[model samples]
Target: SLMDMKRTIERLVLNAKMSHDLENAKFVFVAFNYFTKALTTDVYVPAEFAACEYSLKEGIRSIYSTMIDPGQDALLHSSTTHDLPLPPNALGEKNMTKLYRNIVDYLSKCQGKGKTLVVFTPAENITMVKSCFRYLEDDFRDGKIQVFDIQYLLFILKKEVMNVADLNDEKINKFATDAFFKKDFFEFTAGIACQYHEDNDRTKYCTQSMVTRWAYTFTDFMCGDLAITVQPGKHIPA
Candidate 1:
């Protein structure tokens, strides 16, 4: 099956043989979902172009499972108007707000100095825009809008599940409901919302994740000072 897909990709690549940059720019799905139309169809071969000879499997695996490194001490500001225990005193609120303000202030300083912010997040936590607004509204007015939201992530997930032939509606609904409570959802929200653009090229402003993946590869591409975790876990870097 991989070979068949690979061959298809090779043909595609041959057809689109323009330049190395263009060749690399094409986004092709290395993985596909298909069933045997006939009993005789046994082997499927993917094309050379389709084969991720490098570390795509690792890359995707890391993408799906990579946690933010513990070394980076980025504060994950929570504003989920849900069951979170609110601060009992004004001092606590002031302290928490000050922390957010500091992050915004730091990012403001970094803007236009050859830096970019990349924000990646899910739908429910879109309210983070408001949180950032409280602190960075003036900075935003001064050209600091480096925020982007993948707010329709649920719709994307739903599209993926609904593609399955015998998906249980009840199970899907339950899973969607529970997804909101997961740390991954919140992390994605925070991560996607912190991106910014500067200079002729774009860059990531704040790198937020509970697990860190192949930072080497990303650093090679972006060439920015990564405040990533040097350690594996522990939530805070030593």
Candidate 2:
């Protein structure tokens, strides 16, 4: 069944024209991989991509399961406190706003406890969700809850791995490597930088330059200060 979904998803990605469609495909595939334990299928296979009701529902459920409690109903569930109400229109635009608010609350409780939450959505949805939860920008900057869009990520992945012949194991591995090096790795480093500056000055060091400096500092520490050296011209550097 996963293999079947994977074949369908790959076909959809290959044929995707609009950016949104491609992003949805990417999100669905990644969410499927995140929930499943089968590493081989996770990396090499894509899930089914369809605009049909069943496919869309399945995709949403898969992502929601990874984001929140897997046993809870994604559309009609409350947070830990049960204070947030399920929106009347469960799958409507208003529901998205409500879900994001609840997520912010959830992340707030988990903040600074060695726990983190990463949420992935489409580019368009990111704008709307950010607007709805604008007050949580601090949380976003503080690395409590990290949010990213799939659209620009798809752009980077496509640019890094061009002319994909097949969605096989080797090609998939190459895509994953390229994606990490060219996209996810950079974002992860940037997040670290943001967190460092947030610790230093919540208001003053929120600029891109500050983040860049922190990134440089981190890399310097890893390569220069933290490197283990035992001999001259014979030691392996970090």
Candidate 3:
């Protein structure tokens, strides 16, 4: 069944251009998430399947449910899977860099061999992309390396999804405004604290232990220092 679903999604993506439509984009994203999980495991318990099933069904239902009006009720819950941090000892910067090198080497070896290489990144991790492949930016611009970000691809679809759900745009706007103020406050405080340090290094402003803990915490939150390649095409299927 997983294989069937994967093939169906692949067909839809390649032929139907489902990625171009709003509602269809959501379907394609959830389908890819399910496909990725299925690729790794053959056995699926009800609990494991429930979340995916719920997401798929809710996403579809939201369209009709919010057709007349959009509000908080129409908003889909964030995926539990992504909310959790990666495990300790998960992939890290060194590992990600090594993986990127291997991919690069493989592509070089396959040159003119009817083989192709593709790279994908989430919008949030564009910084990671630049850091990981600074040398490849020119290559990317020259068309030697192809890069894609699903956020851009799904922009129209996301707008449509929001439009249909009629989500409380005013509330979001207020929330964003408050969040920006808080961020500015924190940044200002951090800057002053860093300036007070004798070493003139921002890292010195925080206690060593606190800095170390935050370093690891950030790594965990960002999927072990940006492990974007761990799931291959799973991260940006759309």
Candidate 4:
């Protein structure tokens, strides 16, 4: 059953890659409220197979059921997970930095050995990429580091290939060639790029589907080709 589901997920992933349509296929996970009691040994359960037994007993139920119940008005219920503060013993910046250094050293040791990491996130989440760049600049200035924010790369693809203002769902689905559309796409995307960089305001970043689905389709293609590159080693300040 698990293998079947894995095969199904692989097919879905492939279909999204082949169709170049992200609007209907993207996975948006906003139900983190179900994990509020995350660390609880009795009440909370991890989805990982090893941890499922902790809460998936016959009499005991998983929180995922409640989260996924279509009939229930989950939004109205109290969200036990939102805005919760970290525990007293939570890892602080110093410990995190130490861990980061260890990982960096390991990556450096394996440099150019066919090592890779795939970090896919929305344009609004580019702050993480910037933060990584800052760390790399500060610590690993000599290392081979190319942080390709897939969001920006997708924007580049859309600008180069797809028409923004004139393109719609139908046109996007029908366009078979990378250069099938017009140059307006580039101009429109340039405006978006300027807003993202010059505006310097996170709120202005396009996060919703209405603005970014086409670009996401490009991301699916880039991922399919494995053209998006990543290298080993990053510098984290102690």
Candidate 5:
């Protein structure tokens, strides 16, 4: 099944390449940090909104990101999977309106309407980001932008190209080349050993997608016919 999925993904990539759909596309990979309790399944308190931009033409571009202060008592619920800090660790941006403003401004860049923002999964993050920006809501209503699921692409790569499913510090450090991520050494901040990594998971997705383009582009050996270049993500002021 995994192999079958890989071939399918490869086919999708090839189709896009032949059609030149991605040749000029700009991608903004996004992720959110949220918390939920064991009992209450409906409550979703978003803690961060991260946007990492990549370009098929120019490689990696600027990242727009911010931490959300989900009001007091929000930290009572923990993200057990991430082991995020409770109090002083990531007190977060006290002013949500400012964060929202920053995001809205950032998304209103000079890029054309076809630039697409991608999230790992369609369910949680798409809703969370839309809920954060009323402007975003209006734009989507008018077809000003687009969104897609990079998670599927990532799964195809991990299963076929990389043969890995989990993301840990060492594994991430090893496979996630500096072209995809910067900093002298990559660290996993989900454990709270590092500062709140609001950009962690999203960064991982951005890297994977770039590498996916690379994997699909180099089709010479059945390897790939074309190739994508990679550069470290540039940071813009939050």
Candidate 6:
């Protein structure tokens, strides 16, 4: 089984190494944060949009962030978003049009010839982003563009169903990930994004940077620590 795992990754790396766009393809990492509408509902409005670029030609480029204009419902969701470090009103009221414009402009410029959007969450995050805008859902649905899930990559590499010291079940597909080895990713990356970047005032821009950095860092680990696993759940950093 371990031999099969290593062989699969070796073949996977070989294919990637041989891709025609190995140098041209862009990797755009995106993340969002907002509060839920109500206790009974599971919907959320956009509070902030953040993205960044990484590739063979360039590492992580400049960060992109915009505070999304919230509706009255965003205010009503306060009880649900108690854990949100920033309140919905504190995000102020920008404009969904402006948010859409700024993001498309940034993504348009970031995609280069053809880039993919890497999101951390599963189906939920992708749905959240697509539902907010017009063309995004269509693009993703039609395969006009791509949405990369950081967690999904682990599956491709046979790491998603790995043995996690934190979980007792053998089949649950989750990872302690950097959250285990590096403390809370949000707090850790937010500090890094804030202290190194110029602004702490931006909405979830700080946390947005965290996701972008998190994607690259995870990809980076796949080359080393994330490799050579016997049974996935077995690679608990030591």
Highest lDDT model number: 6
lDDT for each residue of candidate 4 in 82-161, tens digit (9 for 90 to 100): 21112332111324344345434443443333444222333442344334323323344443332233333343333322
Once fitted onto the true fold, the runs of candidate 3 whose alpha carbons sit more than 4 angstroms away are 1-20, 24-98, 101-125, 135-159, 166-171, 174-238
Clashes of each: 39, 1, 2, 0, 8, 2
**Candidate 3 residue pairs in backbone clash:** 70-165, 70-166
lDDT of 3 by residue, 81-176 (tens): 211112232112224334345545544443333444433333443333333344222344465343334233233222333444554243434234
Error of 1 at 34 (Å): 44
Q: Against the hidden true structure, what lDDT does model 5 obtain? A: 0.41
Model 1 TM-score (2 dp): 0.28
Candidate 2: misplaced stretches above 4 Å? Answer: 1-61, 65-116, 134-143, 163-238
Q: Candidate 1: how many backbone clashes?
A: 39
Query: CA lDDT of each candidate?
Result: 0.26, 0.30, 0.27, 0.28, 0.41, 0.45
| Model 5 regions more than 4 Å off | 1-21, 37-43, 73-79, 87-90, 110-147, 152-194, 197-225, 232-238
What is the Cα-based lDDT of residue 64 in candidate 6?
73
**Tens-place lDDT digits, model 6, residues 22-115:** 3333456676656543346445566555676644334455567655546535444433432233443445346656566567677777654355
Of the two candidates 3 and 4, the one with more favorable lDDT, higher being better, is 4
lDDT of each residue in 1-238, candidate 5, tens digit only: 4455446555755555456554344445655556442244433455555665544445435555455565633444344344344544555675656665566556667343345522332323455544444322333456533334454443333323322112223353323432232331223222211134334443332323333333222221111212433332321111
- Between 4 and 6, whose lDDT is larger? 6
**Native-vs-model 4 lDDT?**
0.28
Q: What is the lDDT of residue 184 in candidate 3?
A: 25
Question: Per-residue lDDT for 56 in model 1?
Answer: 14
TM-score of 2: 0.24
Q: Encode model 2's per-residue lDDT on 49-159: one tens digit a residue.
A: 111100111121211211211111322212221112233311112233444465445444433346554343344334333333342234454544434544343433343
lDDT, candidate 1, 124-201, per-residue tens: 332343333333234445553333223232222233223332343555453553343242322322232112211211
Model 6: which residue pairs collide? 162-233, 163-233
